Symmetry: D3
Subunit: 149 residues, 6 copies
């Protein structure tokens, strides 16, 4: 029942990796509770990167996340946050293993295709910011076959 | 260019086919201009199937489309409507060709997995209804290689 | 909710196409009720092709079908018999369309990878011959999403 | 050459992973020597989890493998046992790396999709119990390209 | 056995469709006998399109295949010419059926990803033009399972 | 930018993995600047394996490199040398991880399917030997999304 935030960055969308990303999370057995294609404003990007406002690269991170539309999502499942980080792969694309998203598609650390919350409380902040209206709640009929009880 | 409305139906989401559907349209060269996971409310449904409100099965469609979340989408490109219909395949899953979304995943007419605007006219109507705020604009960097001139 | 008989011919096994074949029926929404790797013997083969005892090439069919192990299957679902033939493609690989099993892998009539019941009649009969013990029953948790009512 | 027993648990069948699982072993270069869909008997089950007779969770493992039909298999090759478990992934889905069967599909340790022999000795026992009548033998024509000499 | 000439156009290379193409012919069972990545010269281009020199769109063809590298190939197998054509799909993307290369990735008639000889005769000319040094010969170890005797 | 030499060995070609391989490097974002099907001559082969002269299996490797055609390539991008190797996987298939080329298809050390430059140094050497005419230059239109600046 845990939830994490997953976002396909501008390059992920430009490189036509949207469907592929979602397939990984779907096959794994997680539940999509949020999804949308959106372009970010300056104010939002900065707030999303708030915890870095005082960094050399801050201005860059904003310019980029706004240089194109992105796909925001909410994924729910046991250990979805850590599992999600595992599926995505190492932050530095050169260290990510084949089989992970960044491992199979990313090369440059600045065009690392996607983002995933780093922690549970981190996913909470991220989800509230990106999904003010809340989650889309539904139950999967395959659920008794993905979990015990 | 032209735009069409594609909607992954409740059974499409439950069967974890979201990613796959998107993949095909992405591979064809179309650009996504709208995307959202939605929980349809009775009244909204009735407007969507409004052109059929006179059929003896109207309420049936309403009961179903509201039985679970769906994924709304806007796809753009030349002939996007016709191709969209072609990619989806025939209405009757019994006549739908392998290679099409319905031919590969659907069996029952009442669980056809996906919806596609049947005409350009019904398209503009559908995307206006489902996406009030209009489309998310962007330019595929591979445009010069998908379209001539 | 009829059943049909699909058999991956010796060549299908040699070429490592067992998983692929099984995947297409699984994704279509069909239920496997019978599965087994077996190497057929002379007499049983003559009874399978029994309907062609009066053909010159009859001797060869039996010869071939026995040259290596095959995979016998029982698949269940609406129109599974007719849909199965669609999924398999034309008898002559030269006519089988891309997207169908023979369309994607088969080249020679003699090496056509698979066999499928050509009719509900042939079906209920082949199924009894190959699977004398009957089928293995179970129901898909996503059944209400693949079928109506 | 070496042999291992791989079994697709009831949750693996329900989730439509049969083809997927087989594809991976076929592509690796391994030979399939046994395959069948079985609905396990309680007494058969208790013998399968025999060495766990003492553990508290014994009845749980037994009630479960009986709850749905499974797919039993025999695969042959060099280090097929160790590669088999490597291909499968960490016992606890929380650790299983993307690229492995459990890594891409499993979430709950109780619904870990598949089983593989932990050793050569236990495989001998496993194949002898699940495939009393021995394996279906054949020689791959690509063998001389998978193995040297 | 019969041979044909397939060429991935500049847009195909740009859109990263090289491997996908080869996969389709490999999985069909055909044998690759020639493979080169080339940046075609103006004069060579005019030669390849000689049979069309007085045609109104001649300059377009020339300007086009010269705008970016291409992948030239030789494929061998029974009915490889007509089949290669069936794999590529309708010349007009708008008509190409899902499952074919153009059906899956093309949209604009002038950016249709691939070229395939349309006759055994034309194939010999094109093969003699693109690979004057002849094909790279070799037998496949799965040949006996692709063809009869 | 940096470039490396990848070679799909005879077994790799015989098992029909050419497309598959090219796909992994393509999806990663790397640029193919050289590609070809070649039946290597004894003398050339002997140069390629220079450093292993003093060794014993030397002659063995040579005999093998000439026993069947191969596919030579040049791939360009940041860290393409070590990444190419990370994609290929451990030399010993028993150690190669699922997700990597050898991890997914190799079994025997002698049929490791592929070869990749071990360093930028050897890479420069290998590239010169196999591609004396230089590379084929072009700029992916996706470049700005694969690299920041």
């Amino acid at each position: 029942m845990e939830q994490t935030f997953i976002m396909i960055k501008p390059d992920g969308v430009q490189r036509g990796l949207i469907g592929e990303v979602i397939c990984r999370f779907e096959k794994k057995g997680f539940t999509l509770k949020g999804l949308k294609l959106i372009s970010v404003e300056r104010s939002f990007a900065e707030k999303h990167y708030e915890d870095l406002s005082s960094k050399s690269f801050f201005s860059g991170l904003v310019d980029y996340i706004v240089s194109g539309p992105v796909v925001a999502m909410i994924w729910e499942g046991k250990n979805v946050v850590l599992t999600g980080r595992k599926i995505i792969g190492a932050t530095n694309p050169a260290a990510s293993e084949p089989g992970t998203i960044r491992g199979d598609f990313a090369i440059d650390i600045g065009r690392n295709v996607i983002h995933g919350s780093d922690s549970v409380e981190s996913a909470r902040k991220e989800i509230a910011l990106w999904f003010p209206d809340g989650p889309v709640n539904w139950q999967s009929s395959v659920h008794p076959w993905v979990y015990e009880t």
